Design a protein around this ligand. Structure first.
Ligand SMILES: CCCCCCCCCCCCCCCCCC(=O)OC[C@H](COP(=O)(O)OCCN)OC(=O)CCCCCCCCCCCCCCCCC
Ligand SMILES: CCCCCCCCCCCCCCCCCC(=O)OC[C@H](COP(=O)(O)OCCN)OC(=O)CCCCCCCCCCCCCCCCC
Ligand SMILES: CCCCCCCCCCCCCCCCCC(=O)OC[C@H](COP(=O)(O)OCCN)OC(=O)CCCCCCCCCCCCCCCCC
Ligand SMILES: CCCCCCCCCCCCCCCCCC(=O)OC[C@H](COP(=O)(O)OCCN)OC(=O)CCCCCCCCCCCCCCCCC
Ligand SMILES: CCCCCCCCCCCCCCCCCCCC
Ligand SMILES: CCCCCCCCCCCCCCCCCCCC
Ligand SMILES: CCCCCCCCCCCCCCCCCCCC
Lengths: 54, 504, 100, 480
């Protein structure tokens, strides 16, 4: 039952999570200028809303 | 004034080892042997002139030698070195292990061997530096600067039969583990320095002034936890052990990088000199968790070692089990268990060095590390199976070797403190005998399981054989006469123990 | 007699109109037109702020803003001419190969 | 206030760079000589450094309602001038390969250095706006200097459109702030609010729009998506100048703005900047994981490093060593990014044309150019924060500033992003020492080589021995 080091795999889980998160984040770098402008306006909306909340 | 030179001699020796690459390929090994012998002889001289057998515990801080020079005076950071009995035992141990590593990396006639020697001496001088530094930033700096040379000679100089992607993966895993834990230790160091600056007004990184730091229990617990995570990656403590078998298996096949970097545990020294004196109350509350992690490490390393088909991974898991014993010993607060932990550290270094050197020689003889591909090697080799039998007997815990002295003195002190953990650990010694005999039966006994095990293998070279026999003699001397080592480490061990138990 | 709030709201309306015109159009020319709308709205807001306090600084910032607008319109129309003369197409989604 | 003669003795780098612009322009009008115009540019920038020494002999004073010159301004001016000099040095072999007009590159580089100097000495919303435009629009020219190259034209269009949008956002925010405050001086941004009324919504929303523009300029998440495309598409010396000079100058003027604005210690802006710094560190490190292109990877790295800088910025008013930490980090980041994008520049020099690929292929660099592989490895370790490098000294400074201000979330973000950075930086370095399957002779290429070796020696020496740079940054205190 313990020939493949399960504790090593459970400690290797954050590397898998990091790879999945990086692959997911790289989808937003699609190269479209219109999406870049849209993301700038979305970030402006988020920053303004956060500043108005606090 | 020899500790600054104790760290500088390996650095200059490695630098000139790289420099003399123009003069030949057979040249830098002699320079490497010269600088490692010089460091070892200087450490032996400081041992002989130290008088550690006639000094009494007079309260932390108490050093045989001390030195301070302001490095970053803006932060109050200085090169602050010091030495006492335990630190000197550690530096003598890494000097001997570095000499063995140089003698093991012999006849490596290849281009850029001078850079391999430069990385080796950077690692060894760094280990000496963390063993000698008593400035917290300087200690952390030395702690983290072995990482680049170890990474480069694992990823570039490692096990050549494996793919280059595997060596790079193992090196990156080792680097990420140790450097992330080091950054956590840096956070703890910075928080401790800022707490002392707020509570007093004096800003410093000196260890002797940070000892008297009034703080709450939770803050001390968090600082201790940062230090403990940094030490638990390098100890190794389960489940942070996972870098170690792949780092060993993807180490260079000579079997010198293991001796130079891994096979001396700076983490046990770090716990003894920093986790217990700086945070004694937090260590006292943390002791059951560390003890049960040590028990889990003992049995998990034993079961892991039995399950391997690779000898090198098996030996790495034996190291995990023995360090579980040492981790139990450190948090007992017992002087007998502390001295047993010191003996166990030294004996583990010698015995694992012998095991890894013999495994490297066996791999050069048979071109494989798979235990299902051999058997009956007692009738094919002239010296290797009997020396391997001795070293498996030693790491089995047999009396007559220093491993028994360390292990049973740990268990005597622990049974004075924690009886149930001691009982479970002695059954761990049964498990140790099981995996040692399993390795001996799979490798050297029975019939040949393939074609490479059916031929008369070449004999042992005299340099390799003589340093293996030197390790054998030192282990037997440690088993039968450990008194000089105990008299050397007694004052430092007693001071740490008294500071730990009088603060709780 | 004129509120500062009304002039600021008018400038904000023109700014967000320029922003959505910038986003929704694939043609680069209408993107440049929306950029001109946004910068003119910002200059208008500076004029309103300067005229409210009775200061000359609003018109000075207006002058700096229209200097910026002139220079950016020049550079953007140069880039649009380059895109049209090298691709014969003003579609901005076709200029998208750098990604990842 | 008006201008005195001593105020002119507190203005020399601006005048020197402007006169260099005029002289280089008239020399172009005389003849199209690449060597002479490049040399005139580098002598003008060196003379601006000597003028910085001369004004260091002078004191600190408010030269305009706009400008304020103190040791803070001289430090940032020196960083900007060093970045510009390195850019010209890397640009000469690149422009030697470029079969079109070459000296316009130097004219725009000098004009951007002038804007960086203005941002370094800016004490006023008008000067900040003008300096931002003065570093932005020459970068529109420089990013698409090779406009016939399709990637460079793509990067030019992207950076031009997005920077015009960000300039509109910043200008609108400045207008709203002026509508509230009634004064464009930095020290009056919140002066007319008292009794805990610092959280007025118009001032906060104006500062939010300025934060959108500046965080675009600083590649802060979520205004960061332009960075890999613009970095990869731009010419490599232009990428060097962008990554070093633009971010250093804009972060210096952001440091000054948050220092003297009374609204700088509002909790809302601090929380928003903390979220932006957290997201920038984590997102840049995670997105640089699987990158085989060195320029895109360095763009994500720039995102993470500006996140660390933002962490240092948040602890300004609570702590004391925050501006010193920013100075030390900026010096280390300047030298590291200079060396990194410099190796990218010299291996992409000479310019091979609009049609040929500019792919780097760093794998196996040691076996045909060992010293550049060593310098690339040193800067990869420096951007990772390895203790033998000054990048660690900056990391230690920002970690100390986060510990002192008890910014534990940002400290944990620094540690986690540092580990992810270790993965991708060490992958790049070990790839440099791998084996390549299959695949100059002037003195300006050697000048770029000695520039990257000097930067490596400085980062290694100040990694082992950081005290001279610490004492250099500490004396550069401003007029409080
Ligand atoms: C993911 C990898 C990185 C690891 C995580 C990142 C670091 C996390 C640190 C969490 C710290 C939580 C602190 C909670 C309270 C904060 C506010 C507060 O009340 O602080 C109290 C105190 C300041 O009050 P004062 O009286 O001035 O201090 C004198 C102390 N007697 O505050 C102090 O005195 C300072 C307290 C400092 C505490 C130690 C910080 C480092 C601890 C080690 C690292 C974190 C734990 C181990 C790793 C977790 C798993 C990765
Ligand atoms: C993509 C991967 C990365 C992202 C995902 C993974 C998670 C990353 C983050 C991990 C770390 C989380 C934060 C850990 C620190 C929490 C600090 C905290 O809550 O402190 C509260 C308190 C502070 O002390 P306080 O009591 O306030 O002092 C003043 C009066 N006494 O504290 C106390 O009183 C003491 C509290 C001690 C227990 C908290 C720390 C637990 C640490 C667990 C790991 C280590 C476990 C031990 C070692 C295991 C083997 C190595
Ligand atoms: C309860 C009161 C009385 C307690 C004392 C009396 C009872 C205990 C007696 C235990 C006797 C066990 C004997 C096992 C001998 C195995 C020898 C052998 O050759 O085993 C086969 C194998 C060899 O390994 P290998 O070289 O790989 O060979 C190829 C694999 N066939 O090797 C193996 O497979 C390894 C076998 C490992 C056996 C471990 C035994 C541990 C015993 C612990 C005793 C604990 C007592 C208390 C228990 C808890 C009570 C609450
Ligand atoms: C016991 C708990 C309390 C103490 C906690 C102590 C924390 C610090 C010490 C432990 C660190 C564990 C790190 C585990 C991953 C180690 C890196 C690794 O395994 O990398 C290998 C892998 C690449 O493998 P490969 O298959 O080659 O990649 C595909 C491309 N060929 O690489 C990858 O796939 C990508 C690797 C990305 C970088 C590594 C992941 C970093 C994640 C954050 C680490 C900080 C700690 C967070 C909390 C940990 C859990 C408590
Ligand atoms: C009443 C008689 C006055 C005689 C002297 C008049 C001139 C004195 C003040 C001169 C100020 C010159 C300012 C030049 C600024 C140039 C800025 C260039 C930026 C690139
Ligand atoms: C502190 C900086 C640490 C990294 C320095 C990197 C540069 C050192 C000088 C060059 C060394 C090159 C060694 C190449 C060895 C290749 C071996 C291949 C066969 C195993
Ligand atoms: C995706 C990567 C996420 C990384 C997260 C890193 C988190 C590190 C640990 C942060 C712990 C913060 C604890 C704050 C306690 C504040 C107590 C205040 C009391 C007044």
């Amino acid at each position: 039952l313990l020939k493949r080091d399960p504790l090593n795999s459970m400690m290797n889980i954050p590397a898998v999570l990091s790879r999945f998160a990086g692959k997911g984040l790289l989808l937003s770098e699609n190269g479209y200028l219109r999406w870049y402008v849209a993301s700038m306006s979305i970030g402006a909306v988020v920053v303004l809303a956060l500043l108005m909340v606090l | 004034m020899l500790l600054p030179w104790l760290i500088l001699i390996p650095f200059i020796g490695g630098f000139l080892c790289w420099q003399t690459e123009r003069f030949g390929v057979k040249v830098p090994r002699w320079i490497a042997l010269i600088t490692m012998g010089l460091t070892l002889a200087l450490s032996l001289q400081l041992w002989l002139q130290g008088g550690y057998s006639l000094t009494q515990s007079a309260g932390i801080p108490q050093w045989q030698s001390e030195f301070d020079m302001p490095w970053i005076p803006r932060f109050g950071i200085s090169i602050h070195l010091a030495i006492d009995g335990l630190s000197l035992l550690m530096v003598v141990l890494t000097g001997l292990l570095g000499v063995l590593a140089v003698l093991c990396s012999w006849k490596e006639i290849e281009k850029y061997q001078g850079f391999f020697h430069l990385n080796l001496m950077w690692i060894l001088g760094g280990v000496i530096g963390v063993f000698l530094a008593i400035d917290m930033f300087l200690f952390f700096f030395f702690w983290e600067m072995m990482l680049v040379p170890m990474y480069f000679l694992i990823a570039l100089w490692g096990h050549k039969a494996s793919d280059g992607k595997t060596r790079i993966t193992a090196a990156t895993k080792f680097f990420i583990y140790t450097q992330a834990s080091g950054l956590v230790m840096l956070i703890a160091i910075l928080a401790l320095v800022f707490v002392h600056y707020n509570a007093t007004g004096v800003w410093t990184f000196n260890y002797e002034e940070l000892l008297n730091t009034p703080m709450s229990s939770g803050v001390e617990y968090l600082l201790m936890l940062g230090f403990f995570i940094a030490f638990a990656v390098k100890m190794p403590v389960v489940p942070l052990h996972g870098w170690l078998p792949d780092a060993h298996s993807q180490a260079p096949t000579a079997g010198s990088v293991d001796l130079a970097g891994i096979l001396l545990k700076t983490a046990a020294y770090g716990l003894l000199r920093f986790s217990l004196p700086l945070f004694p109350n937090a260590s006292a509350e943390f002791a059951p968790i560390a003890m049960w992690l040590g028990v889990i490490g003992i049995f998990y390393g034993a079961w892991m070692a039995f399950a391997q088909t690779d000898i090198k991974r098996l030996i790495a898991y034996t190291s995990v089990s023995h360090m579980g014993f040492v981790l139990i010993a450190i948090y007992t607060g017992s002087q007998l268990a502390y001295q047993g932990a010191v003996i166990q550290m030294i004996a583990h270094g010698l015995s694992a060095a012998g095991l890894f050197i013999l495994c490297g020689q066996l791999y050069e003889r048979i071109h494989t590390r798979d235990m299902r591909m051999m058997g009956g090697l007692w009738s094919k080799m002239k010296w290797l199976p009997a020396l391997s039998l001795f070293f498996a007997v030693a790491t089995l815990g047999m009396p007559g070797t220093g491993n028994f002295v360390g292990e049973f003195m740990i268990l005597f002190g622990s049974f004075q403190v924690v009886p149930v953990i001691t009982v479970i650990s002695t059954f761990g010694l049964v498990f140790a005998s099981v995996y040692s005999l399993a390795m001996l039966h799979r490798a050297y006994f029975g019939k040949a399981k393939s074609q490479i095990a059916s031929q008369e293998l070449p004999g042992m070279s005299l340099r390799e054989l003589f340093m293996i026999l030197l390790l054998v003699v030192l282990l037997v001397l440690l088993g039968f006469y450990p008194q000089p080592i105990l008299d050397t480490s007694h004052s430092a061990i007693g001071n740490i123990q008294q500071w730990f138990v009088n603060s709780v | 007699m004129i509120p500062l709030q009304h002039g600021l709201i008018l400038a904000a309306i023109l700014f967000v109109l320029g922003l959505t015109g910038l986003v929704i159009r694939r043609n680069l020319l209408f993107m440049l037109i929306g950029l001109e709308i946004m910068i003119n709205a910002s200059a208008l807001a500076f004029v309103v702020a300067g005229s409210y306090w009775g200061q000359t600084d609003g018109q000075v910032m207006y002058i700096l803003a229209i200097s910026l607008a002139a220079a950016e319109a020049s550079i953007g129309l140069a880039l649009l001419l380059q895109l049209h003369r090298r691709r014969q197409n003003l579609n901005i989604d076709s200029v998208s190969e750098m990604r990842g | 206030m008006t201008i005195t003669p001593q105020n002119l003795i507190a203005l020399l780098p601006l005048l020197i760079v402007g006169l260099t612009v005029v002289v280089v322009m008239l020399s172009i009008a005389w003849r199209r000589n690449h060597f002479l115009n490049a040399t005139l540019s580098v002598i003008g920038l060196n003379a601006a450094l000597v003028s910085l020494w001369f004004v260091g002999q002078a004191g600190a004073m408010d030269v305009t309602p706009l400008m304020r010159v103190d040791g803070f301004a001289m430090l940032y001016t020196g960083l900007v001038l060093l970045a510009s000099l390195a850019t010209c040095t890397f640009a000469y072999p690149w422009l030697e390969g470029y079969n079109d007009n070459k000296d316009e590159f130097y004219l725009l580089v000098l004009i951007a250095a002038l804007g960086g100097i203005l941002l370094a000495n800016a004490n006023h919303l008008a000067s900040l706006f003008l300096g931002i435009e003065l570093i932005s629009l020459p970068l529109f020219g420089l990013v698409g200097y090779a406009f016939r190259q399709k990637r460079s034209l793509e990067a030019s269009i992207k950076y031009t459109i997005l920077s015009a949008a960000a300039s509109s956002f910043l200008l609108f925010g400045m207008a709203l702030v002026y509508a509230q405050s009634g004064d464009l001086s930095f020290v009056a941004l919140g002066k007319n609010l008292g009794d805990g009324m610092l959280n007025e919504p118009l001032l906060l929303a104006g500062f939010g729009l300025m934060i959108v523009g500046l965080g675009f300029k600083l590649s802060l998440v979520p205004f960061h998506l332009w960075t890999p495309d613009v970095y990869q598409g731009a010419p490599a010396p232009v990428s060097t100048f962008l990554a070093t000079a633009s971010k250093i100058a804009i972060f210096g003027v952001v440091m000054r703005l948050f220092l003297y604005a009374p609204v700088g210690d509002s909790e809302a802006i601090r929380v928003v900047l903390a979220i932006i710094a957290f997201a920038s560190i984590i997102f840049g490190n995670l997105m640089a994981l699987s990158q085989t292109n060195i320029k895109r990877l360095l763009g994500y790295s720039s995102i993470s490093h500006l996140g660390y800088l933002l962490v240092a910025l948040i602890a300004l008013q609570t702590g004391e060593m925050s501006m010193e930490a920013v100075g030390v980090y900026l010096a280390g980041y300047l030298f590291s990014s200079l060396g990194a994008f410099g190796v990218v520049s010299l291996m992409s020099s000479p310019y091979r044309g609009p049609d040929a690929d500019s792919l780097f292929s760093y794998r196996g660099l040691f076996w045909h150019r060992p010293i550049l592989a060593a310098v690339m490895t040193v800067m990869m370790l420096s951007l990772a924060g390895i203790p033998m490098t000054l990048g660690f000294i900056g990391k230690f400074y920002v970690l100390a500033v986060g510990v002192q201000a008890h910014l534990w979330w940002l400290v944990g973000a620094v540690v986690v992003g540092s580990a992810i950075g270790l993965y991708y930086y060490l992958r790049v370095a070990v790839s440099l020492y791998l084996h390549a399957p299959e695949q100059p002779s002037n003195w300006q290429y050697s000048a770029g080589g000695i520039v990257v070796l000097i930067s490596a020696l400085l980062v290694l020496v100040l990694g082992v021995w950081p005290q001279p740079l610490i004492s250099i940054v500490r004396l550069a205190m401003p007029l409080m």
